[PDB]
Amino acid sequence: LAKLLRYNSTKSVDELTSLTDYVTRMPEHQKNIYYITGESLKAVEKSPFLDALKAKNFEVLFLTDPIDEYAFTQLKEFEGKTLVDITKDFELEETDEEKAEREKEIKEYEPLTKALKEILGDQVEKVVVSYKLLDAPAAIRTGQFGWSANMERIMKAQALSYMSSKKTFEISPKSPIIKELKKRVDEGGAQDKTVKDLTKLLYETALLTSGFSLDEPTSFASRINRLISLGLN
Amino acid sequence: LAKLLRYNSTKSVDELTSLTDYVTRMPEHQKNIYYITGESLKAVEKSPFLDALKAKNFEVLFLTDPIDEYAFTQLKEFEGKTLVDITKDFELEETDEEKAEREKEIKEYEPLTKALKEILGDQVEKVVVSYKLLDAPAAIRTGQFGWSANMERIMKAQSYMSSKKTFEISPKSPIIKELKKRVDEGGAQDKTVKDLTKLLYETALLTSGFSLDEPTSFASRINRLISLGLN
């Protein structure tokens, strides 16, 4: 059942592997089994959620078939807890030193997160600075109660109504785009029009990057065209 | 999450009700929250799985939308466990009274259940006599930990290893009672037996939301039967 042998992984592309094989390759200090859910191999392969995991030498399983997606949610553990990393996880508290050094950096960034919460409005449950996010300015994490992008995808054809999920807008503090927005926001930029349009544009990019799709793409498109037209005089 | 108010039920047709409403209507001796999934309200309304629950004064929620079905399987509990009864459930420890009266009967049906397993072959994981089934000769129960019949349908539209289906027979049906006689009279591979159980199993499939393997086999089986009423 769990020796099924039917998934690719960050530590095993081309050749298939089972869950029970994954567990042997786990380093001693890996507490969890990490996987990702998506439509296709090509989609998840380049997800910005992997980068934080790869940096810690942790393996991530690839589940393209929705049957596998449910299976893990009913099981929940093997010896360590299985979990989607599209949803909210806490990586092995990479040293207690950082967990203090962060609270400092997180503090001066809530004015930004506050402003972004206003600009984004109801479309997200939270706006948060995330350190699980590298090589990307922003991404969107499903809440620990909700819909993986892949699930939302399959249920969308058979619904819209009965709501959706509380999505969380993560921003990476090591990204130049976010670093600039903190400057503009900390210098009375919160309600400038160029800022607002771009964070909105930024947010929609995070959606596509994170597997979701846009509501009314024309609004987004016109945001794009506006921006590529800035360089035209 | 659970107060949404978006379901009909055996104790509430016409008017919509929430999970928290259900939980207050439960008698003190109900341990579980019972619901059922199906294509449409009209379809599930007459499911043969409901009869056993109503006879025990248990309310059953109606989940026709797969979104709602997904939610309950992710929720998994409220205080008592939510559960599909299309899948395999264990009825609230019926009583120490029955746990003996049945064990006798299951034995006297071991010739049939064994025989029926042979005619059906790999299509089912088990064949078992069931008392959760009244006013029907046979039905097909998805195994637990798995995908409800309705769910499998939606994901195919959007080897295969589907699910472990179980073929339940009611020892309380005349049709089943006859098969016990014939099988206890050297009937296991009698031809009338084989055709009838297969006829039942395919019906059990359709009644339970699944679709047929080789619909022609069923059809000619059907007409074969209706052609007996002219000779």
Q: Are residues B149 and B106 in the same domain?
A: yes
Q: Are residues B64 and B132 in the same domain?
A: no
**Neighbour-count burial for B160-172, b at 16+ CB within 10 Å, e otherwise:** eeebebbbbbbbb
Angle CA B53–B54–B60, to nearest 5: 65
Please name the residue of chain A whose CA is at the shortest distance from the CA of residue B151: A67
Q: Best mutation site among A148, A151, A155 for testing chain B: the one with the most B CBs within 10 Å?
A: A155
Q: What SS3 state is found at B198?
A: helix
- Total residue count of chain B as it appears in this document: 231
CA atoms of B144 and B88, how far apart (whole Å): 5
A170 phi, psi to nearest 5 deg? -90, 140
Q: Which among B4, B65, B155 has the least Cβ separation from residue A154?
A: B155
Q: Best mutation site among B67, B84, B163 for testing chain A: the one with the most A CBs within 10 Å?
A: B67
Q: Are residues B105 and B202 in the same domain?
A: yes
Please name the residue of chain B whose CA is at the shortest distance from the CA of residue A155: B67
* Host H or E run for residue B61: strand B60-63
Residue B41's nearest CA partner among B61, B57, B17, B23 is: B61
Amino acid (one-letter) located at B168: E
CA atoms of A220 and A214, how far apart (whole Å): 8
Q: Best mutation site among A4, A5, A37, A70 for testing chain B: the one with the most B CBs within 10 Å?
A: A70
Q: What CATH code is carried by the domain that includes residue A194?
A: 1.20.120.790
User: Chain A, 36-75: which have a CB under 8 Å from a chain B CB?
Assistant: 66-67, 70, 73-74
Q: Resolution in angstroms for this experimental structure?
A: 2.9
Please name the residue of chain B whose CA is at the shortest distance from the CA of residue A150: B158
| A90 at B interface, C-beta within 8 A | no
Contact B158 A162 (CB under 8 A): no
Inter-chain contacts counted by CB atoms under 8 A, chains A and B: 34
Sheet of strand B138-142: strand arrangement = B126-129, B165-169, B138-142
What distances in angstroms separate CA B13 from CA B23, B36, B45, B47, B59, one per listed residue? 16, 14, 9, 15, 11
CA atoms of B152 and A10, how far apart (whole Å): 29
Our measurement of the distance from residue A232's CA atom to the centroid of its chain's CA atoms, rounded to an integer in Å, reads 34
**Strands, E assignment, chain A:** 7-9, 12-17, 33-37, 60-63, 82-84, 126-129, 138-142, 167-171
| A144 at B interface, C-beta within 8 A | no
CA atoms of B79 and B33, how far apart (whole Å): 9
Q: Residues before each break in chain B (C–N > 2.5 Å)?
A: 158
Q: Which domain holds residue A179?
A: 96-229
**Residue B90 domain flag:** no
**Neighbour-count burial for A148-182, b at 16+ CB within 10 Å, e otherwise:** bbbbbbbbeeeeeeeebbebbbbbbbebeebeebb
The residue from B63, B84, B105 where one domain ends is: B84
Q: Where are the alpha helices (DSSP H) in chain B?
A: 19-25, 41-45, 50-55, 66-75, 98-108, 110-120, 149-157, 174-183, 191-207, 215-228
User: A36 is written with which tokens?
Assistant: 């990702």
**Residue B91 domain flag:** no
Q: What CATH code is carried by the domain that includes residue B46?
A: 3.40.50.11260
Q: What SS3 state is found at A16?
A: strand
Residue B210's nearest CA partner among B158, B161, B149, B168 is: B149
Q: Are residues B19 and B59 in the same domain?
A: yes
B47 phi, psi to nearest 5 deg? -60, 140
Give yes or no for a contact between A110 and A62, defined as CB atoms under 8 angstroms apart: no
Method: X-ray
Q: Residues before each break in chain A (C–N > 2.5 Å)?
A: 160
Give yes or no for a contact between A125 and A87, defined as CB atoms under 8 angstroms apart: no
